[PDB]
């Protein structure tokens, strides 16, 4: 159930390939993306990591799964705070 | 990955280099990926062009890159050699002009030159265009390099012809020299065999057919049926310049024959290529025969 996304993490300089799973929650998706950004090129922060379609203003629910999100493989997401 | 020491030459040469090998060998990355010669859509127009006219050529070898110019010329040594030849031609032109050579040719020879010599600039430019085509399509950089130098040599001959056309016109201003050559190329019967031959040859787009028709049929015919007869007629008409100029051009032409024959030898390592090369020679030879016969009738008229 591998599910590739292209993810841009808040305050990082690029978009990266992150392969997540169809049944991952958004919380779990954010954690998998953060692994490749936080304490590498982005300072660690308190606050809730949220996922959204790239450049959109609406956030996915934290416990919504990739499978029910309406996202398609290889679409671009942002991982942001608050 | 493991640790490896530096190699003394390129990795592709290291398990076996001359200056020639170092700077000439295996540079066409466009042969690496059969379905995508170029780093573009596999169906881009130029990728389709190359897949048809290079990759799919009925002339086949598993290692075209292994071809080697028998003269192993590189840009540096080509210019060393040709600077020497142009020094020769420059002194020829300068000193023959000083002694008013063109005044001393037999009566009427200027009209033979206007008709049979000055329009060669069109033939030579066709050779130039054609050699450039074989350059860009050939499946090995060592083959392409021979074609580059041959393209340059063709421009060399064109330039010689332009210079002498103008110069001769200074002594013979009423012969149409430098004025009538396009019309002759287009309409004079003696040129129509050559023009038909080159128009058709320039639209043979398979790299192998292009090579065989240009270098194994057209160019040897020009040596035997144009260059050499022109020398003989010149001597008979007290033109001592033209045969000496052609001598230097024939040096280029023999070099073209030398690498061409070497490529045929390479190709014939695949026994299937004999029939393919022979088939193209048999196809093109009749046009070349007629080109020669029409030209020689005009020269003897």
């Amino acid at each position: 159930s591998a599910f590739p996304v292209h993810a841009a993490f808040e305050k990082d300089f690029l978009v990266q390939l992150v392969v997540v799973d169809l049944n991952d929650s958004m919380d779990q998706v954010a954690e998998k993306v953060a692994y490749h950004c936080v304490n590498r090129r982005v300072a660690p922060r308190e606050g809730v990591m949220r996922v959204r379609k790239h450049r959109s203003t609406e956030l996915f629910p934290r416990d919504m799964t990739i499978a029910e999100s309406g996202l398609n493989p290889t679409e671009v997401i942002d991982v942001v705070f608050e | 990955f493991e640790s490896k020491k530096p190699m003394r030459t390129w990795s592709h040469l290291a398990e076996m280099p001359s200056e020639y090998d170092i700077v000439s060998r295996k540079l066409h990355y466009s042969t690496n990926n059969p379905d995508s010669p170029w780093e573009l859509s596999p169906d881009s127009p130029m990728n389709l062009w190359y897949k048809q006219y290079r990759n799919a050529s009925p002339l086949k070898h598993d290692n075209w890159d292994a071809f080697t110019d028998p003269d192993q010329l590189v840009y540096r040594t080509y210019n060393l050699m040709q600077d020497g030849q142009e020094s020769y031609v420059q002194s020829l032109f300068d000193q023959f002009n000083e002694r008013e050579h063109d005044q001393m040719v037999r009566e009427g020879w200027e009209h033979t030159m206007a008709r049979c010599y000055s329009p060669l600039r069109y033939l030579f430019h066709c050779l130039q265009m054609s050699s450039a085509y074989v350059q860009q399509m050939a499946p090995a950089s060592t083959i392409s390099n021979c074609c580059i130098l041959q393209t340059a040599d063709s421009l060399r001959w064109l330039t010689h012809t332009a210079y002498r056309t103008h110069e001769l016109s200074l002594t013979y201003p009423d012969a149409g020299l430098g004025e009538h050559e396009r019309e002759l190329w287009e309409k004079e019967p003696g040129w129509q065999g050559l023009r038909e031959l080159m128009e058709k040859q320039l639209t043979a787009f398979d790299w192998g057919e292009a090579f065989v028709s240009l270098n194994l049929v057209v160019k040897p015919m020009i040596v035997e049926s144009i260059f050499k007869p022109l020398q003989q007629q010149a001597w008979e008409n007290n033109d001592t310049l033209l045969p000496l100029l052609i001598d230097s051009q024939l040096k280029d032409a023999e070099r073209h024959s030398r690498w061409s024959k070497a490529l045929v030898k390479h190709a014939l390592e695949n026994p299937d290529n004999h029939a393919v090369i022979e088939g193209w020679i048999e196809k093109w030879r009749p046009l070349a025969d007629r080109a020669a016969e029409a030209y020689l009738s005009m020269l003897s008229s």
Binding site: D12 | F1, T9, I22, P45, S144, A152, E196
Partner: protein, 490 residues
């Protein structure tokens, strides 16, 4: 006596004729010639401004090579490999890999014009162009060959274009688009006017000066010599553009210039931007990459375009903004993913260097500096795991370079995507997506390296599998920090 060139030159390009045994279109098919339906006779007005002749050519070029090779031989005891700054050695490695076999590819762009251009003067100048680019390809193989015995990364002077290394794919995608993959008139416009006249001429002047500063006179001399060839063939585009404009093809001409300048810029930003602002020792930086773009590239484009009757490309303000930002992100990426490069990137973010960056790019520290702060503290704590990547960057389906933006306090990153014939494409700028849509058949079924990764072509499906796919043959070939992280000591 000899007669002056001006008296016989016209006969050297009196070579057009009216075909009868084949048609004009068979002889010059539009897909290879690019004549846009403009008939033969109109092309005879084509007039190259800088004329030359075969005897002159072989004479001057013999002299040029005599000097270039004599200097190389006389300085072979100078031991540049051992005595140069690592920054300079990496500059050589990057340059030779990105350029040498590309120069040889340019022979084919010139040959395309020599055969298929309807303009006689173009066909002759392109013949000299074939020879010039032959020279440049051979020089830039012969010279780095000397260093093979010192360092396997110099093998990439030959190997890069034979590889699937990501920067090599970006170079090949660009050069196959503007040099080898289009009709003759497109090559004249995109290669000789936009790329050579527009970028490489001034770049090579800059690089030769840099080489002298680095104490590498063999390379300074080599690059200076190559630059003196440029105008002889780079001149071909101008008259082609004039001809198009005079014959109703202004918008077609503009489009080709627009496409080529942007594509050149993105590659230039990844290859040369980091060298100028980061690899070059601070004391030897006469100006920033931005100042260079403004001083030597942008203004020249503006005035050469106006002279032709063309306009600044539609994206000019985007271009100007990009010069402030793009190469800083590209540099960060090349360094963080240094293991995928065939040279050793210099981080270039010592405190004194960051002071210079702040001066040249006000606000640099609040942007890229935020990332380098994290990286720098990790280096100081010897957290090598945190300065080594474990995934791939997302890559532009046009430039083949990763998707970047501005980091830190002004975080802004934008991907420009496109659904086209059932497939989702991603682009690193509005202009790159536009280029795609200008000629989708050139691009639409191309797979970038991440597309191939996702499609199963790269095994194992890991960064390690990707390094193998990219053509690395030993541990030593993969890029490392140019200074072994000594920069973090102070």
């Amino acid at each position: 006596a000899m007669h002056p060139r001006k008296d016989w030159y016209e006969l050297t390009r009196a070579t057009n004729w009216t075909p009868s045994y084949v048609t004009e279109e068979q002889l010059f098919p539009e897909r290879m010639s690019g004549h846009m339906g403009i008939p033969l006779e109109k092309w005879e007005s084509y007039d190259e401004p800088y004329k030359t002749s075969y005897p002159e050519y072989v004479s001057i070029q013999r002299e040029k090579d005599a000097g270039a090779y004599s200097v190389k031989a006389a300085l072979e005891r100078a031991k540049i490999y051992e005595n140069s700054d690592p920054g300079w050695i990496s500059t050589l490695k990057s340059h030779y890999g990105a350029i040498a076999v590309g120069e040889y590819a340019a022979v084919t762009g010139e040959g395309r014009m020599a055969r298929f251009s309807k303009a006689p003067g173009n066909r002759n100048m392109a013949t000299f162009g074939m020879m010039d680019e032959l020279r440049h390809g051979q020089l830039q193989l012969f010279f780095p060959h000397e260093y093979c015995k010192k360092d396997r990364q110099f093998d990439w002077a030959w190997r890069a274009y034979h590889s699937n290394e990501w920067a090599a794919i970006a170079a090949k995608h660009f050069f196959d688009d503007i040099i080898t993959g289009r009709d003759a008139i497109s090559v004249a416009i995109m290669l000789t006017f936009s790329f050579e006249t527009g970028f490489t001429n001034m770049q090579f002047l800059g690089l030769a000066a840099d080489a002298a500063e680095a104490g590498d006179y063999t390379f300074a001399n080599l690059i200076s010599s190559i630059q003196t060839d440029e105008s002889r063939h780079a001149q071909q585009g101008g008259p082609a553009l004039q001809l198009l404009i005079e014959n109703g093809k202004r918008e077609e001409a503009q489009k080709k210039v627009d496409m080529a300048i942007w594509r050149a810029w993105r590659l230039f930003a990844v290859l040369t931007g980091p060298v100028m602002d980061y690899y070059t020792p601070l004391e030897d930086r006469s100006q920033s990459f931005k100042e260079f773009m403004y001083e030597w590239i942008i203004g020249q484009f503006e005035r050469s375009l106006i002279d032709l009757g063309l306009d600044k490309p539609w994206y000019w303000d985007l271009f100007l903004k990009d010069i402030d930002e793009l190469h800083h992100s590209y540099h960060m990426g090349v360094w963080y993913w240094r293991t995928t490069a065939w040279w050793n990137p210099a981080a270039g973010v010592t405190p004194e260097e960051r002071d210079w960056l702040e001066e040249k790019y006000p606000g640099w520290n609040k942007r890229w500096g935020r990332c380098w702060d994290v990286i720098t503290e990790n280096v100081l704590n010897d957290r090598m795991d945190l300065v080594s990547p474990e995934t791939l960057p997302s890559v532009c389906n046009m430039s083949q370079i990763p998707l970047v933006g501005v980091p830190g306090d002004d975080w802004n990153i934008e991907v420009f995507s496109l659904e086209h014939n059932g497939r989702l494409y991603h682009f690193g700028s509005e202009v790159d997506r536009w280029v795609f849509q200008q000629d989708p058949v050139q691009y639409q079924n191309h797979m970038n390296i991440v597309d191939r990764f996702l499609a199963g072509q790269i095994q194992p499906m890991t960064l390690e599998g990707a390094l193998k796919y990219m053509g690395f043959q030993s541990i030593e070939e993969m890029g490392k920090d140019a200074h072994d992280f000594a920069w973090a000591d102070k």
